[PDB]
Design a protein around this ligand. Structure first.
Ligand code: GSH
Length: 241
């Protein structure tokens, strides 16, 4: 996250860190039930050096604050049983950039570990609404990951404006969130984490999944996120949640 601040300990108890064995933190995810996470499909694609698609290659840390303190009280370590990447994902366009991760043993709910609420299929997160991005990604483009979980406040951008900022790249699964003036944005290593939106009684709902961007925090280049209401039924069908 560029332009953000340190989160308070336990402020985002649905935020999860996904480590690939031997490589440290790669992506984020969100806790949605005792057994399931939501993340981004693009994080789980094999390359010639490493099989990112193989669930046995990963560790999820729940309740984490600081990447240098992964055994702190309240942090839970879990392996993955399965990675379900959306069947329509493609790694060229990044359309359908969403995956479901099945924990190998359930999470234990606590003050540090709590699921995010999922929005119904019909719910609209309106243009202009302030929402939050969180993660351990880079704090400047090309820069370094944060040890401490970061948060940043960003606003939903109108879809036609988003399309025109990133021509021939924005599908209806995507939404731009940020500022035309730049300054606050997601960045490398934030992918897969949740957008958190404060709803009408103060409960937080997941608005989207950190997906991609052109650079980070640049003028006229807000980050791109996968919309969540579109996938509510797909989540139910694949997870029972
Ligand atoms: S909607 C998912 C979360 N709800 C719960 O974990 C219910 C737990 C207890 N029954 C309770 O204390 O009410 C949730 O509300 N997450 C978002 C949030 O803002 O905390």
């Amino acid at each position: 996250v560029v332009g953000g601040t340190d989160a308070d300990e336990g402020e985002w108890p649905w935020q999860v860190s996904l480590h690939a064995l031997g490589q440290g933190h790669i992506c984020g995810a969100s806790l949605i039930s005792p057994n399931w996470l939501v993340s981004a499909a693009h994080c789980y694609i094999d390359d010639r050096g490493f099989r990112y698609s193989d669930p046995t290659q990963w560790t999820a840390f729940l309740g984490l604050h600081d990447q240098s303190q992964r055994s702190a009280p309240g942090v839970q370590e879990r392996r993955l049983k399965r990675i379900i990447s959306h069947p329509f994902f493609n790694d060229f366009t990044f359309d359908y950039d969403i995956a479901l991760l099945e924990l190998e043993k359930p999470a234990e709910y606590s003050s540090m570990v709590r699921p995010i609420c999922l929005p119904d299929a019909s719910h609209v997160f309106p243009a202009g609404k302030a929402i939050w991005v969180t993660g351990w990604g880079h704090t400047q483009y090309g820069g370094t990951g944060a040890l401490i979980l970061q948060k940043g406040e960003i606003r939903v951008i109108q879809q036609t404006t988003c399309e025109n900022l990133l021509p021939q790249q924005i599908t209806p699964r995507m939404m731009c969130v940020g500022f035309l003036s730049g300054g606050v944005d997601s960045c490398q290593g934030d992918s897969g984490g949740p957008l958190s939106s404060v709803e009408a009684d103060g409960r937080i709902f997941q608005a989207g999944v950190v997906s991609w961007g052109d650079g980070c925090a640049q003028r006229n280049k807000p980050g791109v996120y996968t919309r969540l209401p579109l996938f509510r039924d797909w989540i139910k069908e694949n997870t029972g949640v």
